């Protein structure tokens, strides 16, 4: 009643975009350790019964194309949708291997009115990336 | 009708405007905690409560170490942005 229906035939897709190496133009150092994360995610969502699809070092163009095609799939038999983004970033922006791409442009493909098969279904986006250059020095307890 | 922006959940690794930390060998603080909390609670807690555990783990168990004072002894708190209309259970 107060919970999303999670008993469809399939739990849903889990798209993991793992960007480790960035073009020198971007000027971003390799994201060492991200492979460990991607593998950890794969195994974690596999146990949660998700159809995991991993992708590596995608350009901004490829990220958008991938998301576009995924939103166009028929999710009628899927309970939900999960997308994990591992890469460099800024506020409201995620980086492709060759450059940045607005997070909004990616999520719009899944809007309740642009992806009818997922309307009313939980769309989860896990973002591991910077959202600026502020440093939290914290406070002692 | 339902809003076109409804039923979305954005699980950010860090607060708006801040750096997100990653361990070159163990992986990013956020992803490590997330997978661990999901493995330990995905069969008993609702997702918002799981992510809260993730917030506490990242916030209390992690502190950066660097030869560069600028990135040394820093903290991080993940950011849960939810436009969901119902509770989410992975089992």
């Amino acid at each position: 009643d107060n919970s999303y229906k999670m008993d469809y035939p399939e739990m849903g897709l889990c798209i993991i975009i793992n960007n480790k190496n960035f073009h020198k133009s971007t000027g971003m150092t390799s994201r060492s350790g991200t492979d460990v994360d991607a593998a950890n995610l794969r195994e974690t969502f596999r146990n949660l019964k998700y159809e995991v699809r991993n992708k590596n070092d995608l350009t901004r163009e490829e990220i958008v194309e991938l998301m576009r095609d995924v939103s166009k799939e028929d999710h009628s038999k899927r309970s939900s949708f999960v997308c994990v983004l591992l890469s460099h970033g800024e506020e409201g922006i995620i980086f492709g291997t060759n450059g940045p791409v607005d997070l909004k442009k990616i999520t719009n493909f899944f809007r309740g009115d642009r992806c009818r098969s997922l309307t009313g279904k939980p769309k989860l986006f896990i973002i591991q990336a910077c959202r600026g250059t502020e440093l939290d020095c914290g406070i002692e307890t | 009708k339902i809003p076109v922006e409804a039923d979305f959940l954005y699980a950010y690794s860090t607060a708006p405007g801040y750096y997100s930390w990653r361990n070159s060998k163990d992986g990013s603080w956020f992803i490590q905690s997330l997978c661990a909390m999901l493995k330990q609670y995905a069969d008993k807690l609702e997702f918002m409560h799981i992510l809260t555990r993730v917030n506490r783990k990242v916030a209390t168990e992690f502190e950066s170490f660097s030869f560069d004072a600028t990135f040394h002894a820093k903290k991080q708190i993940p950011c849960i942005v939810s436009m969901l209309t119902k509770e989410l259970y992975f089992y």
């Binding site: 994201r31 350790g33 990336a129 | 690794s13 750096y19 990135f71």
Partner: peptide
């Protein structure tokens, strides 16, 4: 530790 490295920043993202």
């Amino acid at each position: 530790i490295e920043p993202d």
